[PDB]
Design an enzyme around this catalytic site. Structure first.
Site, PDB file in Angstrom:
ATOM      1  N   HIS B  25       0.837  -1.196   0.000  1.00 12.85           N
ATOM      2  CA  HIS B  25       0.000   0.000   0.000  1.00 12.85           C
ATOM      3  C   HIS B  25       0.875   1.250   0.000  1.00 12.85           C
ATOM      4  O   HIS B  25       1.444   1.617   1.031  1.00 12.85           O
ATOM      5  CB  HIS B  25      -0.893  -0.001   1.239  1.00 12.85           C
ATOM      6  CG  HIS B  25      -1.796  -1.188   1.347  1.00 12.85           C
ATOM      7  ND1 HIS B  25      -1.356  -2.419   1.777  1.00 12.85           N
ATOM      8  CD2 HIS B  25      -3.126  -1.310   1.119  1.00 12.85           C
ATOM      9  CE1 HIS B  25      -2.377  -3.258   1.779  1.00 12.85           C
ATOM     10  NE2 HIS B  25      -3.461  -2.608   1.397  1.00 12.85           N
ATOM     11  N   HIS B 259      -4.171   3.424  -3.506  1.00 15.56           N
ATOM     12  CA  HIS B 259      -4.365   2.934  -2.137  1.00 15.56           C
ATOM     13  C   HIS B 259      -3.561   1.654  -1.846  1.00 15.56           C
ATOM     14  O   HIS B 259      -2.880   1.566  -0.819  1.00 15.56           O
ATOM     15  CB  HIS B 259      -5.854   2.701  -1.824  1.00 15.56           C
ATOM     16  CG  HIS B 259      -6.069   1.710  -0.735  1.00 15.56           C
ATOM     17  ND1 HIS B 259      -5.975   2.039   0.599  1.00 15.56           N
ATOM     18  CD2 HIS B 259      -6.314   0.382  -0.781  1.00 15.56           C
ATOM     19  CE1 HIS B 259      -6.146   0.948   1.325  1.00 15.56           C
ATOM     20  NE2 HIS B 259      -6.360  -0.068   0.510  1.00 15.56           N
ATOM     21  N   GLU B 413     -18.515  -3.298  24.121  1.00 18.09           N
ATOM     22  CA  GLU B 413     -17.662  -4.472  24.309  1.00 18.09           C
ATOM     23  C   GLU B 413     -16.452  -4.470  23.388  1.00 18.09           C
ATOM     24  O   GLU B 413     -15.352  -4.838  23.800  1.00 18.09           O
ATOM     25  CB  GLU B 413     -18.421  -5.788  24.092  1.00 18.09           C
ATOM     26  CG  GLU B 413     -19.611  -6.026  25.008  1.00 18.09           C
ATOM     27  CD  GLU B 413     -20.889  -5.372  24.554  1.00 18.09           C
ATOM     28  OE1 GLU B 413     -20.933  -4.809  23.427  1.00 18.09           O
ATOM     29  OE2 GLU B 413     -21.859  -5.410  25.343  1.00 18.09           O
ATOM     30  N   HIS B 476     -29.294 -14.369  24.399  1.00 22.96           N
ATOM     31  CA  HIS B 476     -28.270 -14.179  25.419  1.00 22.96           C
ATOM     32  C   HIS B 476     -27.459 -15.426  25.747  1.00 22.96           C
ATOM     33  O   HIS B 476     -26.452 -15.312  26.429  1.00 22.96           O
ATOM     34  CB  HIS B 476     -28.931 -13.665  26.697  1.00 22.96           C
ATOM     35  CG  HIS B 476     -29.274 -12.214  26.668  1.00 22.96           C
ATOM     36  ND1 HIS B 476     -30.051 -11.616  25.699  1.00 22.96           N
ATOM     37  CD2 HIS B 476     -28.939 -11.230  27.537  1.00 22.96           C
ATOM     38  CE1 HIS B 476     -30.166 -10.327  25.971  1.00 22.96           C
ATOM     39  NE2 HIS B 476     -29.501 -10.069  27.080  1.00 22.96           N
TER      40      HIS B 476
HETATM   41  C1  LIG Z   1     -11.910  -4.495   9.728  1.00 27.16           C
HETATM   42  C2  LIG Z   1     -11.360  -4.348   8.348  1.00 27.16           C
HETATM   43  N1  LIG Z   1     -12.234  -4.375   7.303  1.00 27.16           N
HETATM   44  C3  LIG Z   1     -11.792  -4.274   6.035  1.00 27.16           C
HETATM   45  C4  LIG Z   1     -10.450  -4.145   5.745  1.00 27.16           C
HETATM   46  C5  LIG Z   1      -9.950  -4.053   4.305  1.00 27.16           C
HETATM   47  N2  LIG Z   1      -9.377  -2.725   4.064  1.00 27.16           N
HETATM   48  C6  LIG Z   1      -8.079  -2.415   4.134  1.00 27.16           C
HETATM   49  S1  LIG Z   1      -7.668  -0.754   3.956  1.00 27.16           S
HETATM   50  C7  LIG Z   1      -9.348  -0.436   3.694  1.00 27.16           C
HETATM   51  C8  LIG Z   1      -9.893   0.930   3.436  1.00 27.16           C
HETATM   52  C9  LIG Z   1      -8.926   1.995   3.054  1.00 27.16           C
HETATM   53  O1  LIG Z   1      -9.533   3.215   3.452  1.00 27.16           O
HETATM   54  P1  LIG Z   1      -8.717   4.216   4.372  1.00 27.16           P
HETATM   55  O2  LIG Z   1      -8.592   3.710   5.770  1.00 27.16           O
HETATM   56  O3  LIG Z   1      -9.345   5.545   4.113  1.00 27.16           O
HETATM   57  O4  LIG Z   1      -7.236   4.144   3.762  1.00 27.16           O
HETATM   58  P2  LIG Z   1      -6.515   4.965   2.619  1.00 27.16           P
HETATM   59  O5  LIG Z   1      -7.332   4.586   1.373  1.00 27.16           O
HETATM   60  O6  LIG Z   1      -6.707   6.419   2.813  1.00 27.16           O
HETATM   61  O7  LIG Z   1      -5.179   4.409   2.439  1.00 27.16           O
HETATM   62  C10 LIG Z   1     -10.149  -1.646   3.809  1.00 27.16           C
HETATM   63  C11 LIG Z   1     -11.634  -1.639   3.648  1.00 27.16           C
HETATM   64  C12 LIG Z   1      -9.542  -4.112   6.907  1.00 27.16           C
HETATM   65  N3  LIG Z   1      -8.223  -3.999   6.761  1.00 27.16           N
HETATM   66  N4  LIG Z   1     -10.038  -4.206   8.172  1.00 27.16           N
HETATM   67  C1  LIG Z   2     -24.704  -6.278  23.107  1.00 24.51           C
HETATM   68  C2  LIG Z   2     -25.278  -6.269  24.486  1.00 24.51           C
HETATM   69  N1  LIG Z   2     -24.438  -6.015  25.527  1.00 24.51           N
HETATM   70  C3  LIG Z   2     -24.894  -6.022  26.795  1.00 24.51           C
HETATM   71  C4  LIG Z   2     -26.215  -6.288  27.086  1.00 24.51           C
HETATM   72  C5  LIG Z   2     -26.725  -6.317  28.525  1.00 24.51           C
HETATM   73  N2  LIG Z   2     -27.665  -5.212  28.740  1.00 24.51           N
HETATM   74  C6  LIG Z   2     -28.996  -5.301  28.667  1.00 24.51           C
HETATM   75  S1  LIG Z   2     -29.880  -3.831  28.810  1.00 24.51           S
HETATM   76  C7  LIG Z   2     -28.369  -3.026  29.061  1.00 24.51           C
HETATM   77  C8  LIG Z   2     -28.252  -1.555  29.287  1.00 24.51           C
HETATM   78  C9  LIG Z   2     -29.491  -0.814  29.649  1.00 24.51           C
HETATM   79  O1  LIG Z   2     -29.271   0.521  29.222  1.00 24.51           O
HETATM   80  P1  LIG Z   2     -30.343   1.217  28.284  1.00 24.51           P
HETATM   81  O2  LIG Z   2     -30.308   0.667  26.898  1.00 24.51           O
HETATM   82  O3  LIG Z   2     -30.136   2.678  28.512  1.00 24.51           O
HETATM   83  O4  LIG Z   2     -31.739   0.725  28.900  1.00 24.51           O
HETATM   84  P2  LIG Z   2     -32.674   1.320  30.028  1.00 24.51           P
HETATM   85  O5  LIG Z   2     -31.785   1.226  31.278  1.00 24.51           O
HETATM   86  O6  LIG Z   2     -32.919   2.762  29.801  1.00 24.51           O
HETATM   87  O7  LIG Z   2     -33.786   0.399  30.223  1.00 24.51           O
HETATM   88  C10 LIG Z   2     -27.247  -3.948  28.969  1.00 24.51           C
HETATM   89  C11 LIG Z   2     -25.830  -3.500  29.124  1.00 24.51           C
HETATM   90  C12 LIG Z   2     -27.089  -6.550  25.927  1.00 24.51           C
HETATM   91  N3  LIG Z   2     -28.383  -6.828  26.075  1.00 24.51           N
HETATM   92  N4  LIG Z   2     -26.583  -6.520  24.663  1.00 24.51           N
HETATM   93  O1  LIG Z   3      -5.406  -7.704  -4.535  1.00 28.00           O
HETATM   94  P1  LIG Z   3      -6.529  -7.691  -3.502  1.00 28.00           P
HETATM   95  O2  LIG Z   3      -6.344  -8.772  -2.453  1.00 28.00           O
HETATM   96  O3  LIG Z   3      -7.938  -7.641  -4.103  1.00 28.00           O
HETATM   97  O4  LIG Z   3      -6.391  -6.265  -2.710  1.00 28.00           O
HETATM   98  C1  LIG Z   3      -5.094  -5.781  -2.303  1.00 28.00           C
HETATM   99  C2  LIG Z   3      -5.208  -4.856  -1.098  1.00 28.00           C
HETATM  100  O5  LIG Z   3      -5.974  -3.697  -1.462  1.00 28.00           O
HETATM  101  C3  LIG Z   3      -6.873  -3.437  -0.375  1.00 28.00           C
HETATM  102  O6  LIG Z   3      -6.297  -2.721   0.748  1.00 28.00           O
HETATM  103  C4  LIG Z   3      -7.243  -4.788   0.164  1.00 28.00           C
HETATM  104  O7  LIG Z   3      -7.828  -4.714   1.476  1.00 28.00           O
HETATM  105  C5  LIG Z   3      -5.915  -5.504   0.092  1.00 28.00           C
HETATM  106  O8  LIG Z   3      -5.159  -5.331   1.309  1.00 28.00           O
HETATM  107  O1  LIG Z   4     -30.019 -10.954  37.457  1.00 27.00           O
HETATM  108  P1  LIG Z   4     -28.945 -10.632  36.421  1.00 27.00           P
HETATM  109  O2  LIG Z   4     -28.800 -11.742  35.396  1.00 27.00           O
HETATM  110  O3  LIG Z   4     -27.616 -10.156  37.016  1.00 27.00           O
HETATM  111  O4  LIG Z   4     -29.496  -9.328  35.599  1.00 27.00           O
HETATM  112  C1  LIG Z   4     -30.876  -9.257  35.185  1.00 27.00           C
HETATM  113  C2  LIG Z   4     -31.036  -8.366  33.960  1.00 27.00           C
HETATM  114  O5  LIG Z   4     -30.648  -7.025  34.297  1.00 27.00           O
HETATM  115  C3  LIG Z   4     -29.862  -6.535  33.201  1.00 27.00           C
HETATM  116  O6  LIG Z   4     -30.620  -6.045  32.064  1.00 27.00           O
HETATM  117  C4  LIG Z   4     -29.108  -7.728  32.690  1.00 27.00           C
HETATM  118  O7  LIG Z   4     -28.566  -7.513  31.375  1.00 27.00           O
HETATM  119  C5  LIG Z   4     -30.166  -8.802  32.782  1.00 27.00           C
HETATM  120  O8  LIG Z   4     -30.935  -8.887  31.564  1.00 27.00           O
END
Ligand SMILES: Cc1ncc(C[n+]2csc(CCOP(=O)(O)OP(=O)(O)O)c2C)c(N)n1
Ligand SMILES: Cc1ncc(C[n+]2csc(CCOP(=O)(O)OP(=O)(O)O)c2C)c(N)n1
Ligand SMILES: O=P(O)(O)OC[C@H]1O[C@H](O)[C@H](O)[C@@H]1O
Ligand SMILES: O=P(O)(O)OC[C@H]1O[C@H](O)[C@H](O)[C@@H]1O
Ligand SMILES: [Ca+2]
Ligand SMILES: [Ca+2]
Lengths: 675, 675
Positions: B25, B259, B413, B476
């Protein structure tokens, strides 16, 4: 008023459901009941026809709040009753602890994993725009529906929602209307501890319209007005800020304690008396509320009745489009569409399966209008766009049109996955796909798993499947990825070896109605195989080279099938006779009859698997496994294969060792088991 | 000027490296050379001591641009040479196609998967702030270093960077300085096709400071000034917008074609002549440039020399803290720290392993200052905070202090996973952890895989491990999750059955220096086992119940070990004698001697595995497998176990069937293989 009584009814149904289960989430249902009431009053839907294609869609992205959704569905006379609410969170009920589209009438998608629903809503809205652009004509608004989404602080923290919201703003999706439950509480307490960003400013930066409702605990007039305002902004998705009190009405309102556990019994009593209900009664449904809601259903059913007449008139005025639309609403692909699939012979040139995939798409996209798809910024690498097609973009940009068929997802794999689920959820037979490198399908695992649980026929075009990609190295080379997805229930993981197998993989992916597909495709060229066909590969696993006096059978996938065939020739020189099995999809194979499967993997012969990634799962089909259980390397691909001994000689050596290991032993098929 | 010559040297080294490989690149290296030159001139680092704890850190989040990084490291006299550049992207070289911290001197983290590096930078900066708050004293700036990150449009599209950027802004991380390569080009072409958001407005919404450099192709004075400005803003991370031309100087500058593939040979010639280099020469390093860079290295080495004297004086003035700091910089845990681990007997009460985990943390956090960690908005559910500790927050908020030990990650996460990698990468013996539900560790797979590849000792506290969580239901409940991570090289996946096993899991996780850990923990209570100990569980797998005349051995993990013990009693009534093996970590077990492993899983006896999720992998250790290969259900946990026949009687039935299946057969250990 009747509206006030309806809101109290919703609140108390939700609280009573949580109470009966002694499990679940009362806080957000209490806070969002006014908004739910207001939104459902604006929505067009038929509780007796959940699949009406011009319905407004509702998505509960904060799926933990599902007692709210279930209460709405019950009150509106969906196929869900108060008796089902009483069984909230109980084994086998129609009211599971998070909503599941397979199980719950009126649940468009499966939510609970935070962030997914809003992205699904983006996909429903994307599909609606594409659908309307394809079919609507002057005086024929076949599709003009909205997508309403509720989401909370948790969804707004999850990166997948940022991805989808950036993209939705770019795509000017004016029929998307989302509502943020701005209650300043999550599980860890105040949002001040972790989530102090200016959400509204961020959404403006994506190109969304904003409406703020400062008292969403009571002000249903303002919530209704916010919807009207959003409908006037046709070139921006809208975020409605609903400032609510979590657990509104509870003694414990405005606290994290009200988020996720049942209320105290005395709290429920005071809720009921403050709102004019009997504190001795649970699951009350005042007849006034039913009557009011029934009026809205009757009006909506008359709207659908008129839509049906519009559709009949459309079929007369636009005969070809009308027949196409009918076919799609019947869930049927075009007759003999699969005759467009490319077929190859062993005399044809070697081709990478990413390029074979391009060629398939080039032939089937013109034949099957319900195919749309895209790539996560890897279009010229995944080879996912058919030449001559137009991109899905708002026409205002000059970069495409909503009638387009190719989506520029940007570097957004997770949102692409969840958007694909939304496009599938829209219906109308959409068969949609998304390209990235196989290793980065893993970025989207949250959504992919939901494709499986939700039974959506989405397709990942997952190129650069192995160490065969070469120089990009171990950060790009899958090891664990196929094992992960094969270990997930209900995912077809196709790893085609050649042209005919690639066509079989697409036949499966497009015909699918309940099973998501991942197509693991190569960067590097592979030969056309002697013995492959669409017919045989459609069985998921098949005997490529039959050897009636086999000393060993080698089972392989993808790029390793040709390797196995070359190893067979080396083994012949060592006095060992091998057969070869190609296993392009383990799930499809597993679904074949026991007798068919045993014809492929018989008793009485050692079986060696060969696949250049994890050996997990392979003992289902083999006695010994030659795989790659370490990370890869950065170098020219053939040199990496040589380093790890994935060569004809390396396979032959392990095959000979396998034959020797079973000398004097009785061998039964890996398909046999004790239970 | 010499600065202009340095920039040209960097550009041409990068281009020549790509040319030699005929892979990689060149575009972003050409565009970012001025910024790289400017940043490295401001950075404090020692090429001869890559681990100096007060170094500034640099992270290339757009890791595809690594020819740029390698060129900087070579020019500054790291343990990387022009001869290594000539082997860019070649098998076994020190210059892989994306940077790997294990292989490349001066690569702090492993990047290439987009979005990760910026999040890693957030973690390095978080650690620096916590470290400085812990050790700095008046006249003793032990830690005052900065974290510099380069990232592109792709990183900004990936949701993980939004998560980390929201959190970094909340945490007021003023020593983080990121640089956006604003070149308006990605793989699919112009960013107009998919990425039209106002990035700057979004970053302001997170609470970041912004500096814009409109001509970052030439204006190194403005880039240097932007760094100075950022350093004055002590309570906000800064984003520096570098408006560049991708491939600057190339005939193909400003296009997607520049790129990701090598430049044409004639293009490279005109680059060289425009910049005063010999078009016939490759890998030129003008001695002026070396001299200029050496001056900066010599100055930095004098700074480190003075830091060493500061540290010696610190140890005199602050004897206790000084000894603690020394120990940590030596990579040693406190002597006999593990004596704080809780120990249990079979007479103790049943406890959920999430609660056992809380208790472990409560005992070891006060003993081991280098332990910090958090939860992704699941603190009261994962049980990850020790009572009495303070949260890591800027003191300005009143919610914590930078000396705090508990991180409120919010519902993030993936960023939590990548931030953990950054905290580990900081060094100083940090042993850091992150809590969520096991099923949502999958949201962070992109980062988790990099923990393994990067060899970082991070720990996931992954509670609610199975259908045992009950009512939250199948969205879950993990099925595939352990198989996925066990199939990834270099991940210890501990699934402790009881109190002693949970202490062994933490002993492993905290002692780790090269292997990430996932601790799969229960919601539901489990009994203390007869026969468990920290000593035996530390072997990864051990014989819990020895039976010298066993008809069958049952191997199990976690919640299913107690189930196996109960099944043993049922089998006794059927005249079948069983042994039980507990396998709390398959990786640790695999690393034991062959003789030890065979003492646990001997020849001559059928072996049945029992674990309430995917059977993938289990054939390594068993002849037959009882698992759960379908999605779960929403109901009370014991009812779900009964539904799927994970009961003493259900296990006994399958054990009896296994004994019958092997009657008349010769059985060897699953540990045996042909090769
Ligand atoms: C999680 C993830 N998804 C897809 C790719 C494949 N990939 C490599 S570079 C790129 C995008 C290039 O865009 P940018 O970050 O703007 O780089 P620049 O073109 O400016 O070099 C992608 C989609 C990757 N490396 N990681
Ligand atoms: C991807 C994911 N991570 C974690 C959880 C656990 N979880 C359930 S509800 C919640 C957060 C509650 O916050 P919000 O969305 O503001 O709900 P409210 O308290 O207002 O009911 C989490 C962390 C989930 N359901 N999904
Ligand atoms: O020849 P290809 O494998 O299609 O692409 C070459 C690179 O060009 C882009 O960054 C892709 O994510 C690869 O890292
Ligand atoms: O009793 P626990 O399993 O600790 O928690 C009960 C729920 O309270 C929170 O939304 C958690 O994500 C669960 O869905
Ligand atoms: Ca909230
Ligand atoms: Ca770019």
């Amino acid at each position: 008023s009747v509206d006030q009584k309806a809101i109290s009814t919703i609140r108390l149904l939700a609280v009573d459901a949580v109470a009966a289960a002694n499990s679940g989430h009362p806080g957000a249902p209490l806070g969002l009941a006014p908004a739910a009431h207001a939104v459902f009053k604006k929505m067009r839907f038929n509780p007796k026809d959940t699949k009406w294609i011009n319905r407004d869609r509702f998505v509960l992205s904060n799926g933990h709040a599902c007692a709210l959704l279930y209460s709405m569905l019950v009150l509106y006379g969906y196929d869900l009753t108060v008796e089902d609410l009483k069984k909230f969170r109980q084994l086998g009920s129609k009211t599971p602890g998070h909503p599941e589209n397979t199980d719950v009438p009126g649940a468009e998608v499966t939510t609970g994993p935070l962030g997914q629903g809003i992205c699904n809503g983006v996909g429903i809205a994307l599909a609606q725009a594409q659908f309307a652009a394809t079919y609507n004509k002057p005086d024929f608004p076949i599709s003009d529906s909205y997508t309403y989404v509720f989401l909370g602080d948790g969804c707004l923290m999850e990166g997948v929602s940022s991805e989808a919201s950036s993209l939705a703003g770019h795509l000017q999706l004016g029929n998307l209307i989302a509502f943020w439950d701005d209650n300043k509480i999550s599980i860890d307490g105040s949002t001040e501890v972790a989530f102090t960003e200016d959400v509204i400013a961020r959404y403006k930066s994506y190109g969304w319209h904003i409406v703020e409702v400062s008292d969403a605990d009571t002000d249903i007039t303002a919530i209704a007005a916010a919807i009207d305002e959003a409908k006037k902004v046709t070139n921006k998705p809208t975020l409605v800020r609903l400032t609510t009190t979590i657990g509104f009405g509870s003694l414990a309102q405005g606290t994290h304690g009200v988020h996720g556990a049942p209320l105290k019994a005395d709290d429920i009593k005071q809720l009921k008396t403050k709102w004019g209900f009997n504190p001795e009664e649970s699951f009350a449904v005042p007849a006034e509320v039913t009557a009011s809601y029934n009026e809205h259903v009757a009006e909506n059913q008359k709207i659908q009745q008129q839509w049906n007449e519009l559709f009949a008139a459309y079929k007369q005025k636009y005969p070809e489009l009308g027949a196409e639309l009918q076919r799609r609403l019947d869930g049927k692909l075009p007759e003999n569409w699969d005759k467009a699939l490319p077929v190859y012979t062993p005399a044809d040139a070697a081709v990478a399966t990413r390029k074979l995939s391009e060629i398939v798409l080039s032939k089937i996209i013109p034949e099957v209008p319900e195919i749309i798809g895209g790539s996560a910024d890897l279009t010229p690498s995944n080879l996912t766009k058919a030449k001559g097609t137009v991109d899905f973009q708002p026409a205002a940009t000059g970069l495409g049109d909503y009638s387009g068929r190719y989506i520029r997802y940007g570097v957004r794999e997770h949102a692409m996955g969840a958007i694909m689920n939304g496009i599938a959820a829209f219906g109308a037979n959409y068969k949609n796909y998304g390209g990235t490198f196989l290793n980065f399908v893993s970025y989207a695992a949250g959504a992919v798993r939901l494709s499986a649980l939700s039974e959506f026929p989405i397709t990942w075009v997952a190129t650069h499947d192995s160490i065969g990609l070469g120089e990009d190295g171990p950060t790009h080379q899958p090891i664990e990825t196929l094992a992960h997805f094969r270990a997930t229930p209900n995912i077809s993981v196709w790893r085609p070896a050649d042209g005919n197998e690639t066509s079989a993989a697409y036949k499966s992916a497009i015909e699918s109605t309940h099973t998501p597909h991942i197509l693991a495709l190569t960067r590097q060229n592979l030969p056309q195989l002697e013995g492959s066909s669409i017919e045989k590969a459609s069985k998921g696993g098949y005997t490529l080279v039959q050897q009636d006096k086999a000393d060993i059978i080698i089972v392989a996938t993808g790029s390793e099938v040709s390797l196995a065939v070359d190893a067979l020739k080396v083994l012949e020189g060592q006095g060992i006779k091998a057969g070869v099995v190609s296993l392009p999809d383990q799930l499809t194979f597993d679904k074949q009859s026991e007798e068919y499967k045993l014809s492929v993997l018989p008793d009485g012969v050692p079986i060696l698997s060969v696949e250049v990634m994890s050996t997990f799962g392979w003992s289902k089909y083999s006695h010994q496994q030659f795989g790659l259980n370490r990370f890869g390397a950065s170098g020219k691909a053939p040199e990496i294969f040589k380093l790890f001994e994935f060569t004809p000689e390396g396979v032959a050596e392990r095959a000979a060792k396998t034959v020797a290991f079973y000398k004097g032993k009785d061998v039964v098929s890996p398909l046999r088991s004790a239970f």
